[PDB]
């Protein structure tokens, strides 16, 4: 009962979310360090 | 193959919640900078 | 069309984003608690 249109859409979305989250892990590691001052 | 549209619905929800939380953390981080 | 295995693979990718995310939340919440 599940089309390839929606499944593929969702996998693209998930992939974009992955790359965004790479950037964000970068920012949070940036912020955490240098949080000693 | 095994589809289970209800299952896909659950995953969609999960993705929406995850996007929401993500929005939230981008927020809290961006603010945290001094 | 259909999935089976493909759906599993996607769910594992989402599960991994969820976990990374939760790590980030722990972190930013700790820093937030350091005020």
From Swiss-Prot, chain B:
Stated consequence of mutating residue 29 to A: Abolishes homooligomer formation
Effect of residue 11 to A: Abolishes homooligomer formation
Record note on modification: Palmitoylation is important for expression at the cell membrane and for channel activity.
Effect of residue 18 to A: Abolishes homooligomer formation
Cellular compartments annotated: Cell projection, Cilium membrane; Cell membrane; Cytoplasmic vesicle
Tissue expression profile of the protein: Detected in taste bud cells in fungiform papillae (at protein level). Ubiquitous. Expressed in adult heart, skeletal muscle, brain, spleen, testis, retina and liver. Isoform 4 appears to be expressed only in transformed lymphoblasts.
Residues in coiled coil: 1-34
Taxonomy, superkingdom: Eukaryota
Family as reported in the entry's similarity comment: Belongs to the polycystin family.
Complexes and interactors: Oligomer. Functional PKD2L1 homotetramer can be formed either through C-terminal trimerization followed by N-terminal dimerization of a fourth subunit with a subunit in the trimer or through dimerization followed by trimerization. Heterotetramer with either PKD1L1, PKD1L3 or PKD1; the heterotetrameric complex contains three PKD1L2 chains plus one chain from another family member. Interacts with PKD1L1, forming a ciliary calcium channel. Interacts with PKD1L3, forming a cation channel that is activated by low extracellular pH.
Recorded domain comment: The EF-hand domain is not required for channel activation. Interaction of the cytoplasmic N- and C-terminal domains is important for the non-selective cation channel activity.
Record's function text: Homotetrameric, non-selective cation channel that is permeable to sodium, potassium, magnesium and calcium. Also forms functionnal heteromeric channels with PKD1, PKD1L1 and PKD1L3. Pore-forming subunit of a heterotetrameric, non-selective cation channel, formed by PKD1L2 and PKD1L3, that is permeable to sodium, potassium, magnesium and calcium and which may act as a sour taste receptor in gustatory cells; however, its contribution to sour taste perception is unclear in vivo and may be indirect.
Identification of the protein by name: Polycystin-2-like protein 1
Full-protein positions shown: 700 to 733 of 805
